[PDB]
């Protein structure tokens, strides 16, 4: 009944680690959706400072576009 | 459930009633830049591409309200 009390905290520290790595995937998904709405012929900006933000993503940093930019090119190279 | 031509009369009220960097004049600014880049590319290469969406869209929004597109971006107006 001490190890149970330890797991109540270790699980909280694992859910706070799948919160900061699902944010960093939400941001790439929304950046892809922005690029795709811009390509298919719709007038919405694609700067990282103009994405939408909904507490599943947080504020967008610059490095969350670099990451995306090297990941479309990586995916297009593999087709 | 408003007329499809009465929606412009309000999106444009927002676009007119906006600061210079607000996210309204920054999502339309992409239309202006794509049209401007298209016109420059047309001047240089020589041919006007058969697919020019940005310039046509700016032309429709100009015909919808001329005293707005002439005021915001005063070179596409000319």
From Swiss-Prot, chain B:
Record's subcellular location: Virion; Host periplasm
Function recorded in the entry: Component of the cylindrical core that assembles on the inner surface of the capsid during capsid formation and plays a role in viral DNA ejection into the host cell. The inner core is composed of stacked rings of gp14, gp15 and gp16 proteins. Following binding to the host cell surface, the internal core is disassembled and gp15 is ejected along with gp14 and gp16 into the infected cell. Gp15 probably remains associated with gp16.
Sequence similarity: Belongs to the T7virus internal virion protein gp15 family.
Oligomer and partners: Homooctamer. Interacts with gp16; after ejection the gp15-gp16 complex composed of a gp15 octamer and a gp16 tetramer probably binds both the viral DNA and the host inner membrane. Interacts with gp14.
Name used for this protein in its record: Internal virion protein gp15
Organism of origin: Escherichia phage T7 (Bacteriophage T7)
Lineage: Viruses, Duplodnaviria, Heunggongvirae, Uroviricota, Caudoviricetes
Full-protein interval shown: 436 to 513 of 747
């Amino acid at each position: 009944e001490q190890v149970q009390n330890q797991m109540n905290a270790w699980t909280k520290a694992q859910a706070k680690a799948l919160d900061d790595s699902m944010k960093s995937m939400n941001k790439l998904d929304v950046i892809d959706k922005q690029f795709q709405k811009r390509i298919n012929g719709e007038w919405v900006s694609t700067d990282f400072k103009d994405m939408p933000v909904n507490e599943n993503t947080g504020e967008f940093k610059h490095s969350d576009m670099v990451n995306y930019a090297n990941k479309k090119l990586a995916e297009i190279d593999s087709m | 459930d408003i007329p499809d031509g009465a929606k412009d009369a309000m999106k444009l009220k927002y676009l007119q009633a906006d600061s210079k960097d607000g996210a309204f004049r920054t999502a339309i600014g992409t239309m202006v830049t794509d049209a401007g880049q298209e016109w420059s590319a047309a001047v240089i290469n020589g041919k006007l591409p058969e697919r020019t969406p940005a310039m046509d869209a700016l032309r429709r929004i100009r015909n919808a309200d001329p005293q707005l597109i002439a005021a915001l971006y005063p070179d596409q107006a000319e």
